[PDB]
Amino acid sequence: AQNPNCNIMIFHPTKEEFNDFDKYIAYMESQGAHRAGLAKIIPPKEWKARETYDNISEILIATPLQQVASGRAGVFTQYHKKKKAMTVGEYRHLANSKKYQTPPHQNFEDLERKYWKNRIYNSPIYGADISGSLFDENTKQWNLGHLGTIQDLLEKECGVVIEGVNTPYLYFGMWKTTFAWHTEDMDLYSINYLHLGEPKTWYVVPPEHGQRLERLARELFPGSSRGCGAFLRHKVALISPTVLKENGIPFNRITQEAGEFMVTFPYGYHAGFNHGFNCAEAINFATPRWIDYGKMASQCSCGEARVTFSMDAFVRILQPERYDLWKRGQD
Numbered sequence: 001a002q003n004p005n006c007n008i009m010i011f012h013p014t015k016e017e018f019n020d021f022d023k024y025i026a027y028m029e030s031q032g033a034h035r036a037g038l039a040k041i042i043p044p045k046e047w048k049a050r051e052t053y054d055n056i057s058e059i060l061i062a063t064p065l066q067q068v069a070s071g072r073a074g075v076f077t078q079y080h081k082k083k084k085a086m087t088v089g090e091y092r093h094l095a096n097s098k099k100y101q102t103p104p105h106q107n108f109e110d111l112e113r114k115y116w117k118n119r120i121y122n123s124p125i126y127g128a129d130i131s132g133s134l135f136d137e138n139t140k141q142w143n144l145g146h147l148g149t150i151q152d153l154l155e156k157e158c159g160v161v162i163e164g165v166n167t168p169y170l171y172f173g174m175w176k177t178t179f180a181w182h183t184e185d186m187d188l189y190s191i192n193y194l195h196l197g198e199p200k201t202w203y204v205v206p207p208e209h210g211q212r213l214e215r216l217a218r219e220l221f222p223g224s225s226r227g228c229g230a231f232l233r234h235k236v237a238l239i240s241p242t243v244l245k246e247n248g249i250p251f252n253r254i255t256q257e258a259g260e261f262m263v264t265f266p267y268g269y270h271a272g273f274n275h276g277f278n279c280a281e282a283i284n285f286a287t288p289r290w291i292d293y294g295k296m297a298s299q300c301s302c303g304e305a306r307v308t309f310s311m312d313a314f315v316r317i318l319q320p321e322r323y324d325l326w327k328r329g330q331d
């Protein structure tokens, strides 16, 4: 078995190898990359996502989210308070202000220590989940707005034809902005490109051990667990690496820098934080290997997780028993 310790793998495709996205994903899995839940892909040196970022300040963040924490430093939840709209130029100036900017630090490890010590005492503002793309239309390789759709994958593998569309999302971050522990909707893959700015640190649990993280989360967030049988779908819970190590949860960490892709694999729990002002683009995708994960994915029916139009069809076709109750939650 390849990659039996479930380490995060780093790939350096040539420009030739970067032509065929599907083929490269299958390659990475042939080497065991999926076992980690997360892989890094460094694009060939000849590739670029777009010519310059010189003109992005006019993008609107219609609903910036203030991420307010509750709990203790290593075990907390966050709620998202909606803020007034602002442009990316306005958000970047806020990120760089004395109140919100990255503190002085020695290296990524010192910064990680400071994040886990101090996160809960601040409320950074995250411009998350903005439909759009920063890839140039002329970028033909690994252009996250030109991928094969999940609906088309389901049609090719299973014959069934369904409604829905699959488009990318932009994320504008600042110091301490946080993504809570989650898997993707319907345990899909994700791919995330860091277009510019400061790094993003990721933590990940191997898919084969995801249920260990779930059991810990039920112990650490016991009221949330009684409220919903899949409350990590709410995307609000944080657990630090220290706490994971104290409880024997297998995990890995890696820091993504500007210009790099990350892929999350089906049922790979992940969480993390931004080091400073940045912009990422991400989208969900599927392969044939995902189908079985999609059939088995948990679902929030308490009603809180409230997800996309396109997820309806996935549930309806892959999980027809759950359909009914999942849609009672979503209506």
Ligand SMILES: O=C(O)CNC(=O)C(=O)O
Pocket: 171, 178, 179, 190, 191, 192, 264, 270, 280, 282, 283
């Ligand atoms: O970048 C972020 O805030 C969160 N991204 C993801 O969870 C992802 O790409 O799957």
Ligand SMILES: [Mg+2]
Pocket: 055, 056, 057, 058, 059
């Ligand atoms: Mg602009």
Ligand code: NI
Pocket: 182, 183, 184, 190, 264, 270
């Ligand atoms: Ni994700």
Ligand SMILES: [Zn+2]
Pocket: 227, 228, 229, 230, 231, 233, 234, 300, 301, 302, 303, 304, 305
């Ligand atoms: Zn729920």
